[PDB]
Amino acid sequence: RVCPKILMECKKDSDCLAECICLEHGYCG
Amino acid sequence: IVGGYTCGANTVPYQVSLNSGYHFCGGSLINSQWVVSAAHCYKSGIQVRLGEDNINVVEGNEQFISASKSIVHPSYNSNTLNNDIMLIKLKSAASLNSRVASISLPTSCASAGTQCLISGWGNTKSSGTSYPDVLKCLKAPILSDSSCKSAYPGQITSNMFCAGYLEGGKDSCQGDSGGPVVCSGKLQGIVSWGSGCAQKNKPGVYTKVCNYVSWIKQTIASN
Ligand SMILES: [Ca+2]
């Protein structure tokens, strides 16, 4: 997956950049 | 940083934290007024925090300066992360001293196998989240272009290199973006992306700073 290593909060996968997804504790990864 | 050790307070004096109410990316001080980081770290209203170790406690050596201008590379592609580099000009010049110092730009690209130092306040777990209070460090080798291209078919451009461990377990991770990869005392890479963190056969990918040195120098002297 292409997932940039920025720290970003999220509530759903669509909140994250590129192919990062939203993990269980509320941050993209 | 996953699988790292603790750098020690102010032992990486060129490391900065970019803050928009919380830490979200790193950067490196390249002179008193300019920071280089990753273009995907662009945000309006960045505060640059220098002289940091524990990002939650005031320890006395910090300088907090707002960004006055961020210049994203002209060819940055947000879909492929090609040319993932940005320069940030500080509103006022930082006071350089023993705890806050700039890092030199490279005169040549580093070769595969060179050991480099990667640092940041990013996630320390490959599965799960544990975000550290103090700066973490990792020594990792530059990998060959073949290994890099092999690990990420069709996703590596000439402006990227891989560094890390094909076995996994040690890598940069979310919150480390924009931070430094230093080899031989020169800034050779910027933390950019990967497929997760510290996964087997998925080493971190870094912006290849030696391809941009004339652009950086031209931009700094002209703004
Ligand atoms: Ca602090």
Q: What residue spans define the domains of chain A?
A: 1-29
d(CA B220, CA B215): 9
Q: B51 C-alpha to center of ligand 1: Å?
A: 8
Active-site pick, B28, B37, B40, B70: B40
Contacts of B192 in chain A (CB under 8 A): 4-5
Query: Does the active-site annotation cover B40?
Result: yes
d(CA A27, CA A22): 6
Enumerate domains of chain B plus CATH numbers.
Answer: 1-12+103-210 (2.40.10.10), 13-102+211-223 (2.40.10.10)
Distance B205 CA to ligand 1 centre (A): 28
Q: How was this structure determined?
A: X-ray
Provide the β-strand partners of residue B5: B137
B142/B189 Cα distance (integer angstroms): 10
> What is the C-alpha separation between B52 and B36, in angstroms, rounded?
17
SS3 content of chain B, % helix, strand, coil (to 5): 10, 35, 55
Residue B211, both tokens: 């391809």
SS3 B142: strand
Q: Using alpha carbons, list the distances in angstroms from residue A2 to B62, B78, B81, B105, B154.
A: 34, 11, 9, 27, 11
CA distance B74 to B8: 36
Q: Are B191 and B204 in contact (CB under 8 A)?
A: yes
Is residue B84 annotated as a catalytic residue, yes or no?
Answer: yes
Q: For the CA atoms of B126, B136, B33, B181, what is the dihedral angle to 10 degrees?
A: -60
> For the domain A1-29, what is the CATH code?
4.10.75.20
